[PDB]
Amino acid sequence: SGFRDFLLKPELLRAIVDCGFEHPSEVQHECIPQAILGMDVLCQAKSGMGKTAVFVLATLQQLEPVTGQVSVLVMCHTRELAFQISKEYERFSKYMPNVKVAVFFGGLSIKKDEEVLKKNCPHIVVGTPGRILALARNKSLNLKHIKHFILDECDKMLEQLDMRRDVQEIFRMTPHEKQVMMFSATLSKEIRPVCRKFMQDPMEIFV
Template identity: 75%
Template sequence: MDVICQAKSGMGKTAVFVLSTLQQIDPVPGQVSALVLCHTRELAYQICHEFERFSTYLPDLKVAVFYGGVNIKVHKDLLKNECPQIVVGTPGRILALAREKNLSLKNVRHFVLDECDKMLESLDMRKDVQDIFKLTPHDKQVMMFSATLSKEIRPSQTEESHCHESQSVCKRIFKKVPDTDTVKGISTEWCPMEIYVDDEAKLTLHGLVQHYIKLKEEEKNRKLNDLLDALDFNQVVIFVKSVSRAAELDRLLIECNFPSICIHSGMSQEERLKRYRGFKDGHSRILVATDLVGRGIDIERVNIVINYDMPDSADTYLHRVGRAGRFGTKGLAITFVSCSSDVDVLNNVQSRFEIDIKQLPEQIDTSTYSNAIVEDIAFALGQRLSCLDGPVTWTKLLYR
């Protein structure tokens, strides 16, 4: 069954298509049976890891990930020597390998797009996805997933859509046979099962506490330092709007004795993945990032997200804050508001998702945004609670 599915962030969309694919796949040596496309290298790496984790007891199944920033010869050699049955990757690298005949897609039975709306909104990526789709068989399962699916890209939105281009793209991607094909006089135009959240208010995470702070641009650094010193956090992600701001804020935090790392598109792929793995494994507690990690990335210990810079849209806001409070856990999202355009985005978020985001109070109850066990985190940090004097805070655990 083919499906386009919407569900809130942090509720297991990746597990749905990973387990569904593993349940159905009939691996044949030397043939790619499943193809998963996503928009960033970090997300591709994470999805590949999930396939590997869930296929532990499927010893004959091989999974591989392909993305740019890595010498393409490495990928060509891998495909030549040990062709995987499941391929995960970004559209640009997958298309390059397919066009050069290093990657055969003629036996693909499962075609998955994660964060599909993000891939369809970029003209270049959209074209790559379409070209890849044309290289796969008509007879396959197609699955598309995202937390945000505008009506303009949904296959069922035909006459109602005001954005015909986006709508027609989605229909073309899903279309498996020409519209003129018929079977015994019956049209065979294909339509997927469409699963949507009927009320956008349901897209917000119930365990996520959301607040804003109104301040001037020049006050952001001081306020951020105060928050990091006062809040109890397992891990925190701080979102900024540009590569230069990410690098500068990371430098300032380190100067203030907050051991942060940053991830942005200006880094080499090797360095980005190294830092991503380190943060995911808990080696660092503070991550400064652009929207490169705003979608799909699952770091289970993140319980606080700070929007140092307001995102450009309500959709981006939803994806960013969804890095905290995942899988029903508690979390806290704090957004800095410093100009009129920030206010506009915040108002849009509140009206669209029917939430009341209040100003951050002077005192906030830790139990409303954190359900971590202090002893467990302390152990992970190699600390012992018995050596700490007075109340235990993350500042003590992190910077002792």
């Protein structure tokens, strides 16, 4: 199964080989090619289909790192998944020197997060709506350079009125010209339209 069958940069393909993948799932086969071109995506895929890899690979492939600038924002509902996402970015960026990732899921002292943003500004930020919004509101987190807006476990986030509003306020702070992708193992018929309100003629896949 050609991960090499995708148009990926050499350093990226090499990292994938090192991780021992060799077989994209049907979802990866149908999402990655379009995701790499910056197309918006709404994807419902069961556990094991490799949803994280889809956006991790797609965003690393499009990454045009600028020191002191955050260009990728990923948000999700569970703390465990947030760190697994960061783990994945590290795995696939093994041969891409200086690609920095930071996780802001909710640690006492927002000051610590501000210090990371100020002294070792990351290129990719992964976190929870509340904390991301707080950092954005106090100006520690500059969101004017986001080129990729990604939500994982997107239904759990948007189905809750309070978290939905937070995500909406954050979205409003980012550039219009950007890629938006959302993933979840479960996307009810009722929540799908809500996800699409953040996208532009997105590719859709439900399994």
